[PDB]
Chains A and B, each alone.
With several copies, the nearest count.
Chain A
Amino acid sequence: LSNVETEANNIISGNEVGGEIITKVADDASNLLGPNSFATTAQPENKDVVQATTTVNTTNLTQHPSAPTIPFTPDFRNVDNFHSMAYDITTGDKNPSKLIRLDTASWQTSYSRQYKITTVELPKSFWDDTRKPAYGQAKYFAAVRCGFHFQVQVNVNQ
């Protein structure tokens, strides 16, 4: 195949010795070589590509791709800004972790010194909390490993 096309050419140059005209050897045969050339090229090049995309925790193995097909010069971002509510970004990364309220009210004199007061729950207590992450993301995933930071506030009247 490959050499045969160039044989059609070399025939063309066979009759090209005739400036007429010019020639390139009727009719424009000057290319019967083809575009590198009747082979293969892309379409059923298959494997002709096989793809094997990946995303977090999920692979997509697909056997017959077409093409990326992007619209114009996308250069996509990443604010912006301009600005769009200066808050950045946050969490989760950084919203899931912040101070949060966890407590209540009770007291007076009914309590002897060794009498318990207010027990605050295990790491479940961010989950069952109806606000921050301890609800959204941990209501997806099952496993948690994290440090802990506490401010306890008790204000009395002088």
Chain B
Amino acid sequence: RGSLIIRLSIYASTFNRGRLRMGFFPNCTHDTQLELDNAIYTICDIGSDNSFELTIPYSFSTWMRKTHGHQLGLFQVEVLNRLTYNSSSPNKVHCIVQGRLGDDAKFFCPTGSLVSFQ
């Protein structure tokens, strides 16, 4: 049990700027459009300077969840306004996204698994 704190980190030079959002549904379904406007949000301005964050609270029935391919949510990034560029500028700007689990989390019981082995 615990959340998957997520980070988006955008890289562009100092000149250009832009906003964009981040959808995540904690169930979840099959793609599944602008209901990403329904669910959770988190606006993004870039900027000086990155990076960012949006969390999730732990959402499910029961208490434990299975850690195999049972379930988790859905994630898009959505451009709302453009990321502009000047005549001397990068013209192309981008992202990296890395998650981690904590700080409420914890694990219960062992098992042999495995991925062979690796």
Contact = CB atoms under 8 A, between A and B. Distances in A.
Chains A and B directly touch (beta carbon < 8 Å): yes
Given A131-B37, A131-B38, A157-B84, A59 B26 contact: no
Interface of B: 14-19, 26-27, 34-35, 37-49, 52, 54, 57-61, 63, 80-86, 89
Given A87-B59, A131-B35, A58 B40 contact: yes
Interface residues of A, number: 33
Nearest to B39: A57
Main SS of the interface on chain B? loop
A58 B57 contact: no
Contact of A64 (B26, B38, B45, B58): B45
24 contacts: A43-B48, A46-B48, A47-B48, A57-B41, A58-B40, A60-B41, A61-B45, A63-B48, A64-B17, A82-B63, A83-B58, A85-B57, A85-B60, A86-B59, A87-B59, A131-B34, A143-B61, A153-B19, A153-B80, A155-B19, A156-B17, A157-B17, A157-B85, A158-B16
Given A155-B17, A157-B15, A157-B85, A63 B63 contact: no
Contacts of A85: 26, 57-61
A19 interface: no
Interface string A61-98: 11110000000000000000011111100000000000
Given A61-B43, A158-B16, 17 more contacts: A44-B49, A61-B45, A63-B46, A64-B17, A83-B58, A84-B61, A85-B26, A86-B59, A87-B57, A87-B59, A99-B41, A131-B38, A155-B19, A155-B81, A157-B83, A157-B84, A158-B84
